[PDB]
Design an enzyme around this catalytic site. Sequence first.
Site, mmCIF file in Angstrom:
data_model
loop_
_atom_site.group_PDB
_atom_site.id
_atom_site.type_symbol
_atom_site.label_atom_id
_atom_site.label_comp_id
_atom_site.label_asym_id
_atom_site.label_seq_id
_atom_site.Cartn_x
_atom_site.Cartn_y
_atom_site.Cartn_z
ATOM 1 N N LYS A 154 9.162 -5.686 -16.414
ATOM 2 C CA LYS A 154 10.301 -4.946 -16.980
ATOM 3 C C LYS A 154 9.892 -3.939 -18.037
ATOM 4 O O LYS A 154 10.383 -2.804 -18.028
ATOM 5 C CB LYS A 154 11.320 -5.898 -17.610
ATOM 6 C CG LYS A 154 12.021 -6.834 -16.643
ATOM 7 C CD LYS A 154 13.078 -7.640 -17.391
ATOM 8 C CE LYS A 154 12.462 -8.661 -18.371
ATOM 9 N NZ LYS A 154 11.594 -9.682 -17.702
ATOM 10 N N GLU A 180 12.860 -9.014 -28.441
ATOM 11 C CA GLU A 180 11.574 -8.948 -27.781
ATOM 12 C C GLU A 180 10.390 -9.043 -28.756
ATOM 13 O O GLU A 180 10.563 -9.479 -29.891
ATOM 14 C CB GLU A 180 11.528 -7.763 -26.808
ATOM 15 C CG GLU A 180 12.419 -8.006 -25.563
ATOM 16 C CD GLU A 180 12.028 -9.263 -24.766
ATOM 17 O OE1 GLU A 180 10.822 -9.582 -24.687
ATOM 18 O OE2 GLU A 180 12.931 -9.938 -24.215
ATOM 19 N N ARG A 181 9.191 -8.691 -28.305
ATOM 20 C CA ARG A 181 7.984 -8.957 -29.085
ATOM 21 C C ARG A 181 7.834 -7.952 -30.228
ATOM 22 O O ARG A 181 7.951 -6.747 -30.013
ATOM 23 C CB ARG A 181 6.755 -8.908 -28.181
ATOM 24 C CG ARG A 181 6.624 -10.107 -27.246
ATOM 25 C CD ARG A 181 5.388 -9.957 -26.384
ATOM 26 N NE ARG A 181 5.306 -10.981 -25.352
ATOM 27 C CZ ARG A 181 5.896 -10.907 -24.158
ATOM 28 N NH1 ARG A 181 6.635 -9.856 -23.834
ATOM 29 N NH2 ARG A 181 5.753 -11.898 -23.287
HETATM 30 N N1 LIG Z 1 3.332 -1.527 -12.959
HETATM 31 C C1 LIG Z 1 2.405 -2.481 -13.220
HETATM 32 N N2 LIG Z 1 1.115 -2.314 -12.851
HETATM 33 C C2 LIG Z 1 0.174 -3.251 -13.078
HETATM 34 N N3 LIG Z 1 0.442 -4.419 -13.693
HETATM 35 C C3 LIG Z 1 1.695 -4.725 -14.111
HETATM 36 C C4 LIG Z 1 2.774 -3.750 -13.897
HETATM 37 N N4 LIG Z 1 3.902 -4.305 -14.393
HETATM 38 C C5 LIG Z 1 3.565 -5.516 -14.898
HETATM 39 N N5 LIG Z 1 2.253 -5.770 -14.732
HETATM 40 C C6 LIG Z 1 1.541 -6.998 -15.163
HETATM 41 O O1 LIG Z 1 2.484 -7.981 -15.598
HETATM 42 C C7 LIG Z 1 2.374 -8.199 -17.008
HETATM 43 C C8 LIG Z 1 3.741 -8.373 -17.660
HETATM 44 O O2 LIG Z 1 4.503 -7.175 -17.565
HETATM 45 P P1 LIG Z 1 5.721 -6.962 -18.589
HETATM 46 O O3 LIG Z 1 6.465 -5.715 -18.181
HETATM 47 O O4 LIG Z 1 5.158 -7.111 -19.979
HETATM 48 O O5 LIG Z 1 6.565 -8.285 -18.244
HETATM 49 P P2 LIG Z 1 8.086 -8.606 -18.648
HETATM 50 O O6 LIG Z 1 8.814 -8.439 -17.347
HETATM 51 O O7 LIG Z 1 8.044 -10.041 -19.140
HETATM 52 O O8 LIG Z 1 8.463 -7.609 -19.720
HETATM 53 C C9 LIG Z 1 1.603 -6.999 -17.539
HETATM 54 O O9 LIG Z 1 0.897 -7.295 -18.750
HETATM 55 C C10 LIG Z 1 0.692 -6.671 -16.375
HETATM 56 O O10 LIG Z 1 -0.431 -7.552 -16.354
HETATM 57 MG MG LIG Z 2 8.960 -7.515 -21.646
#
Ligand SMILES: Nc1ncnc2c1ncn2[C@@H]1O[C@H](COP(=O)(O)OP(=O)(O)O)[C@@H](O)[C@H]1O
Ligand SMILES: [Mg+2]
EC number: 7.1.2.2
Lengths: 466, 465, 54, 479, 128, 128
Positions: A154, A180-181
């Site tokens: 996300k 969030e963080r």
């Molecule tokens: N577009 C992307 N390309 C490569 N890796 C991704 C991508 N989106 C997410 N990830 C992987 O998933 C992890 C979590 O994504 P994040 O967006 O932080 O999660 P959340 O949905 O909890 O916010 C990232 O640190 C990365 O390792």
């Molecule tokens: Mg997030």
Amino acid sequence: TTGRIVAVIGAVVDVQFDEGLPPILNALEVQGRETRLVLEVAQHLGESTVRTIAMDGTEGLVRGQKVLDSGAPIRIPVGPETLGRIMNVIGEPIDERGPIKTKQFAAIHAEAPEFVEMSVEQEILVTGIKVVDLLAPYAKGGKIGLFGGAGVGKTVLIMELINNVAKAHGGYSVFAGVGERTREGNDLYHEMIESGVINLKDATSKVALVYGQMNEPPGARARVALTGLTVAEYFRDQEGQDVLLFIDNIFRFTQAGSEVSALLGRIPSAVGYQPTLATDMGTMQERITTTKKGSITSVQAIYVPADDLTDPAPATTFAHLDATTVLSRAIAELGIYPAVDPLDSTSRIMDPNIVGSEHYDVARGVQKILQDYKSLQDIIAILGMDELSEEDKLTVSRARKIQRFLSQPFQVAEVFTGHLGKLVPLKETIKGFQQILAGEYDHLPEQAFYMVGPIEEAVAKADKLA
Amino acid sequence: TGRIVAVIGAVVDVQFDEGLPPILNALEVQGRETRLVLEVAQHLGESTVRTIAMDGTEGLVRGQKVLDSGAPIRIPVGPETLGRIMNVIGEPIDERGPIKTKQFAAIHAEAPEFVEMSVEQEILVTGIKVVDLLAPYAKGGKIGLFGGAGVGKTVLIMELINNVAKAHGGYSVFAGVGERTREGNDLYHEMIESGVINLKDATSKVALVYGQMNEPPGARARVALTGLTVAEYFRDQEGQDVLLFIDNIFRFTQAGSEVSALLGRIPSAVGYQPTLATDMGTMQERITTTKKGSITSVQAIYVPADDLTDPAPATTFAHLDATTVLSRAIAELGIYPAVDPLDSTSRIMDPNIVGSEHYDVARGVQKILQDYKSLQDIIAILGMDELSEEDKLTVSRARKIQRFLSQPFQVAEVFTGHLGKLVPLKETIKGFQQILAGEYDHLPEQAFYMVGPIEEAVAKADKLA
Amino acid sequence: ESTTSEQSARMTAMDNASKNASEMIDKLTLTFNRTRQAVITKELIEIISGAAAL
Amino acid sequence: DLEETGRVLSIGDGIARVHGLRNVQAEEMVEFSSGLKGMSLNLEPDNVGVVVFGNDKLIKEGDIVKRTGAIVDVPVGEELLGRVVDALGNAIDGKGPIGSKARRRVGLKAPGIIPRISVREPMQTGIKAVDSLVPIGRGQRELIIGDRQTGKTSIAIDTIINQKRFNDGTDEKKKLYCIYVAIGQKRSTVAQLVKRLTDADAMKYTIVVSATASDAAPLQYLAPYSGCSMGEYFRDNGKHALIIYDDLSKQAVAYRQMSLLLRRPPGREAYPGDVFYLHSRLLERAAKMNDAFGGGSLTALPVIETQAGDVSAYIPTNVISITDGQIFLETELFYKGIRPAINVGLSVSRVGSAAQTRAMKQVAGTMKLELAQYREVALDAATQQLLSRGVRLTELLKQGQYSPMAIEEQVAVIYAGVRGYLDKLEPSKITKFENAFLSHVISQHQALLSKIRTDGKISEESDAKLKEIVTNFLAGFEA
Amino acid sequence: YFRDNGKHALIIYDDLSKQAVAYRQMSLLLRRPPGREAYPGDVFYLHSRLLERAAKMNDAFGGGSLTALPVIETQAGDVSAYIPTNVISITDGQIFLETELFYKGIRPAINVGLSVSRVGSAAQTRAM
Amino acid sequence: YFRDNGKHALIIYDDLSKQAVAYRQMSLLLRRPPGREAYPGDVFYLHSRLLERAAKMNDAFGGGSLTALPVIETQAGDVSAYIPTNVISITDGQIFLETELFYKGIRPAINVGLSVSRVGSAAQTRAM
Ligand SMILES: Nc1ncnc2c1ncn2[C@@H]1O[C@H](COP(=O)(O)OP(=O)(O)O)[C@@H](O)[C@H]1O
Ligand SMILES: [Mg+2]
Ligand SMILES: Nc1ncnc2c1ncn2[C@@H]1O[C@H](COP(=O)(O)OP(=O)(O)OP(=O)(O)O)[C@@H](O)[C@H]1O
Ligand SMILES: [Mg+2]
């Protein structure tokens, strides 16, 4: 007038007033504290007592302690002087740069725009992201939502959108961090100073930041989305202008509502949620909107408890959106990023009269082949590929490549991928998929379609290996 | 002297004018034909306590007089409990008159402190070949005994009792928690036949504490603690290594769940009590090695719905240092004890704890049985002569390995007509190591079947044919 | 020749089918037990809410 | 004096209800006559609701309750190093008073946006699979998650022991003070664990905080906050600390017990709606400070136990959505012998490349990718060669317990595999190759390992040297 | 008003899922105890009394009519759910829409096999 | 009365499912805390005290006996439901009947695989 505290449990404080009972929503100020502690009036209990929600920690409070009615709701700095600044829930600067010298303030509670104020303008907002642009495109001035369980992408997606769209947009942005963080807030702030979208010298900053993260008690997490939305509302109305509003993560607003509902006296609804889940959400969401005065393009990240899209929180959120991007853990575990579910993401402007019959036909063609493939999988799962006809073997082939071509490397994800980020024009996304559907690339291996930009990069990646 | 103010099933409220009994105190209801003990659970306010009844509450009247005994439930402890059956409140229920003990003890003792803990893991030799080699028991540990009926479960418990007293001298306690009365009677008499209980002299190796299925949940909940208390006298006052059997842990949890519901507490996940893990923890933590000695505990575990993630087995599993898995399939092959050599586990199966020699043999015996499993999935589909030259060698050895896992029991001598064997750990190891080395490929399989030490495996072949 | 090839290939296909089915069974059983527990939990919280509200 | 004192009205229903204490603060520590401590949780018109930090069964109606005047706090400072304490910071190791000179509030809010800076210094575990594929940075939160007995605690313990090498040296930016918080474990287990740490000489820089299985739920609730505060003393005084919460699954069930007895409305698995916040406020406190706040950091390794591999459950997804990555351990990999049983696919570090030595990027920057691709598919073309590489690399990432490796020894091992030298080799032999190869490069090629360490990179002169080592080593043994 | 004054009206309730949610909030906050899924005990009645008002009138009453098309949102295809089952049991027929069909290209995404309407007056048409 | 006076009686409880429902009604209306399937916590104890009264007396106590045949109705064959769970755990075995066996022509419809007597052989004549 002044009240006295009669009860404290976590974020919920009862206050008795001998004269002048403050209206619901009025901000009360607790006396005898090192930093400003606001209590927002939530309920009139009777017997000149109000029940309130604290906007910061309540440790150290004593029964009898005095409280002052400010005579109004929580009011914050609004205007151009918010740009490049960071504010908390109650509008205080948290960036150590001194006062926010705005010429106006605004209450964080406001009536949603009336039905008469609505706009019906539908115009495509090209993202450069293949899955979105192709299957479920965003609209300028529309409401966009990004659904996902824990760690599916996300924030990465929202940060790609900020990178891809904010530049092309010729106005102001607001980012609200809700539950969030804190370190993502720090990362974002310093990255914007580096890139120059925030300037610490000039009045050239193009983004206002508002933060109330997961270190905060529930009152703050419940109200802070209102703080950010109030800043965006000013830019939309007092200017008549195009604002971008980004929120990560709007679920936390609802979650924070459930933590205090517990102490407010309400009988719980399904799954222990506050009985007011859908109306609380509506009162907030209906202000996040384009009107006849100006446009807000809003992008909201939306957490999905235990990956369950039928959970009341995400379930109630869909109705508030014009375009939805649904991320899937299963799609992520195929290593497909962004992990967008092509069979669960929708858009109002996915209409032949709006995107053209060509864009439309290709989008539906992709979805049809992905669904047809999905239907074969219970049979394949047990009986394997040998039970399929040669025509169905091609649907499986064309569908696996289409799945893989919907993946894309992101500029913001180079820290995780080790690949250069790609931005794909809409015309190249359309042509690319239209060719795969036509069987024009039936000769290439699947893996050549993984993590590339335009279609010419698949052909090139296929020649890299023998 | 308190007075009853409320009665609702097994929950009794009692008012005291001055001397309010602390929580956990036992109260004795006056004017009843048999002893009725109430255990204090809460202080309600206004000089009133809520208590849980240890027997039926029929015939109770509001205003009826209740004496505070001044302490928790206290029970007989010492050598005179051996061969006897007591209930949760330490009364004899075997019609053999008073348990004439020189000491009593309270059932809610605190677990030993962190300073009292042994830093070292240590082996408890059972004399049973499967257990000692592949899934050894630890002194101070908790063992999960898995499996239903008809798998030699009662004979294994009795063999463990017999062998522990035979080899180390230590004693056993058996807490029957929520058992059928008919099965408590069967066990009592099965113990008299085997000699672990002796009604004529002082040579009984076990003390029994029974808290039957038809007793209130308060009684069934505290049975395990009553047994622990009996056990704790032997460990502390006699400086021994004691064995506590708990049959079974599921019913201990079940009764805890019922007590919590009686008290009107909001149930947790899957209906269990909010205090599920603390209830378990306050009990299991009294089973430890101290400087005076150790209590080791074998705990029969029932898994509801076959679901290992059910909160009840899941909570227990955290406290276990080993599992002993009894199986019908192993029994149907004619192997006794019917222990599954691949599904049983032990946390002390580490080279630093059991020794380098123990670990190697055990991991070598484990592997060859795993080979035999994959090799048997080729014979059934194809045939015996579809495998290589080295394949038939691993089969021949593995068939003798599962036969040298089987053992005649001392406690099973009355029925089968064969003499039982207690095998030391050192003879178990070097016996199994010789099969893997190939030193007995010239011998028939039936020589390894139902014997003790490897010296019997050599000699039995000479007697045959 | 064809029949020998066909029977051997039938054996293999059925072997693969039953191995795939067993894997699905294992996964579904886990979901079953999770869901089973969650229904008890959900039901009970509803009755407790109903009781508290009186 | 009912302003500063109170009397117990009722007890046995979780929270104690106390009459009086008119002047008591919310969250203030109070003292019972039996020597127990409690926390003023609920301030009501007619009573104070007090969470008891001990066995509530020792409290009776009418007992005297006294104000301390202090919001719940714990002893903090270097006097705690080498000591075992309970959740209140009191000694349980038998060695007498702690001797602390400072204290910190247990519930203190985590640093905001401004006092922080992005994590950039490695937090070295010495475990190949982590330091290469899931690198931790100082101030990061990285979850260790898997079923019972999958090797979770071992990752944590090997991480603590690894720091001895830095803590004995000079390079002060590299030192790391450790805090192991044990929540809900057996006392025997905790004692075996402090034994191992003492054997390894790790106790001198470690604090153990223990609230075990027979400790009341509120103590298990409190333990991680107490440990965290001790870590924060280092974090705020220009030092680096590492905290292990073992485990947060057990903390959350103690909090659910407390919440149910308070009759808070349960949601999924009967957990209260504030379980996320329970963990989010705690984990936010692991942080990297900017230089204006002294430059220190607190790194956190929370532990979560899953049930039958269910990472989509409530408490697991909460924590995943809090931390900056997860190391997923799997039962299937484990009991097959792949240890540590890291699922290289699912395991991520939401920091990634940022906090890792250049020499590691040069090898792991291709190994990371070749293993999530491999997992998916678990004569043929490139699809099959993905499987051939994946099996070798998996075996290459195996590592025995208590077998620390310095980053330079790690890159040399990874190098051999990632460059395709073991591609001709048989998977079974990979383990034997690594042990003999590593001990050989350790014996005579300390110059090479020294060059890679100090330069923090594989230079061209190192690259060509290593290439000659592996090639000549590969051929020449008895099989 | 159209029904009773000799005219014909069609009413669409979009949607009754959201009306039940609002009814649940209101009722809970009035302190009326929560029923199945925290809905009020009479959620069936909420919908049955509404839909019974759609009717065809005889000539002595004006010959007018009111037709209702209520709309129900299911979750993950669960028609066996509480509110969906109530309304299915009330209505004369139902048009079932499915995601699978929608994405397969079947738009309108009607499941013809499951979708039912009551007979039809002889008059739907004649050439139709 | 027969058990204690040296005689032998057989008792059939047809059925205990219905007895638990009646007990649940009383308990809920007495506002006793509800548990799983709204049964009170003492529902196990309801059946355990009843069925433990069936017994075989030794000669020193007259020699008599009481044998119990409780009947449980399952729903869709779910033996993991609360009340069937309780009773299975109390009794010395079960005779399990099935609709599929019944219509196949296996009447009486006894699933031998799923049926057990934990007394077994001891209750049979040598001939049998
Ligand atoms: N577009 C992307 N390309 C490569 N890796 C991704 C991508 N989106 C997410 N990830 C992987 O998933 C992890 C979590 O994504 P994040 O967006 O932080 O999660 P959340 O949905 O909890 O916010 C990232 O640190 C990365 O390792
Ligand atoms: Mg997030
Ligand atoms: N790298 C390794 N190599 C060999 N064995 C290992 C390794 N890591 C862990 N083990 C073993 O695995 C077993 C379980 O390890 P550990 O206690 O770390 O797991 P856990 O998941 O924390 O268990 P618990 O559920 O008991 O908390 C231990 O016996 C340990 O010795
Ligand atoms: Mg562990």
